Design a protein around this ligand. Structure first.
Ligand SMILES: [Mg+2]
Lengths: 122, 119, 122, 122, 122
């Protein structure tokens, strides 16, 4: 019997219970956005609290973007400008008018409020 | 549509399979309080199915144990737990006692995980 | 006339006003649980606040346990995994469906918010 | 025109706008209590906030005390036991059942939230 | 496309989106007050929060003042007495009975919660 730790075990919604996403895994998610015609967008924040609905938009949603390399380059530019921020990649569906995907691509390095996968239970 | 006709002696069986609700009639209804898109916006949850869980045993748990089970469930990664359909208010657990303990459990699990929780 | 100090004199419910429990004393409480057929369970938390109802369950309640040594071993294992935590031993009565005993078996070492017995009054 | 400073200028009710009370001045206030038949009492606290009604009683009110030396000795004893606390001398009238006098006899030394008399305006 | 930074980008009402005011620019604002017959006044505070309506008045509003040099000398005197405070120059119109102008003339030096003009976007 392993015990799920209540200590510094914060999660950040979709994919947070999986191993950290590799560059290849992030690129595969971006291909998913493009294959489905959804609108990529980046958002960032100093802090992440469950009570806080809005983050800050990086530039504008990438309307008409069908090029995964473009999305990956904006991830680089966003994280470069805010190297200590939480940064997430999201995508919008304008037909249902809702966010249809989203996951973290960066956390602050000074953060020690979450566990590596093998330290989640004791 | 289904008030009397199913009991007519002249028929042996009757099943209503479908109804065409026309837009002019649909427009007379308030309808769902929020609906899918608004709900996801209110929960701030995107990109996957939501996860829930009925507390068990169905009946027989105290309010405090209900909240105990709820907290332990939510803290592990479920978005939701729920009362069983037949959990209303009963000698083993009165509803208001439950509501209060459940609210404590939701709050504790939300703070521990950093994710929005409900029950 | 001695004055009961208001300063760093926090208490933690049952047995807090007695001298700290010896290993023998803890063992005797565990015998009591077993003699009465109650369900032993361990719970732990980083912090202890009177407003906070739930702590985190260590594993599961020890249903069917009639062996005090088993309970003592789980105390060791729980405190080993969480050496800085408040840890309490409790027991449940499934007939009345209520916790029927409970007391602290560990506090954080970094805690200076409580007094030794002979420092409670000045 | 001198400007009354808003910065670290906390006050503590009766006599706080006067020069700090000398030993002789405190002794004169105690004589006042005794001459009027009022009940002396000491109270203390770690912190002083306008929102906080009650402080901690030092022992019991000195019922029947007609001896100023006794009151002064209790001041010494209280401040010795709590050298870092706010400590006030108060007096009760049991006929009107109300506190009839009261003033600080000690503040924490670590406190820099109040001004000396000649620094209250700039 | 430049991104407006959410990080340490606090503003302080009128003129905060412009380059910091030079001595000559402040003097020109004072000339404006005098030319219009308005009442100059200085206010200051340790902290600036959007929720906090009142600051502390420096002395009194300069009723009957028609001399810009007098106003400038009070700015010097106010900032000298409170070198770490927010200080603003305001002016009142007694006919409409309302503050008719106002802007910061000093911020705390220890403040790093705002950006220089060329660092507002990334
Ligand atoms: Mg059910």
């Amino acid at each position: 019997m392993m015990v799920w730790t209540p200590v510094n075990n914060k999660m950040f919604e979709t994919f947070s219970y999986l191993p950290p996403l590799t560059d290849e895994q992030i690129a595969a998610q971006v291909d998913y956005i493009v294959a489905n015609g959804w609108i990529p967008c980046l958002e960032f924040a100093e802090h992440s609290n469950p009570e806080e609905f809005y983050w800050t938009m990086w530039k504008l949603p990438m309307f008409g973007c069908r090029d995964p390399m473009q999305v990956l380059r904006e991830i680089v530019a966003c994280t470069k400008a805010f190297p200590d921020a939480y940064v997430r990649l999201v995508a919008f569906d304008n037909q249902k008018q809702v966010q249809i995907m989203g996951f973290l691509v960066q956390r602050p390095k000074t953060a020690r409020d979450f566990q590596p996968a093998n330290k989640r239970s004791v | 549509i289904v008030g009397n006709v199913f009991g007519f002696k002249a028929l042996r069986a009757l099943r209503l399979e479908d109804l065409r609700i026309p837009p002019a009639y649909v427009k007379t209804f308030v309808g769902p309080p929020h609906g899918i898109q608004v709900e996801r916006d209110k929960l701030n949850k995107y990109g996957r199915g939501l996860l829930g869980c009925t507390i068990k045993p169905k009946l027989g748990l105290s309010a405090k144990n209900y909240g105990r089970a709820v907290y332990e469930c939510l803290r592990g990664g479920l978005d939701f737990t729920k009362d069983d359909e037949n959990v209303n208010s009963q000698p083993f657990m009165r509803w208001r006692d439950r509501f209060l303990f459940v609210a404590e459990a939701i709050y504790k699990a939300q703070a521990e995980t950093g994710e929005v929780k409900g029950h």
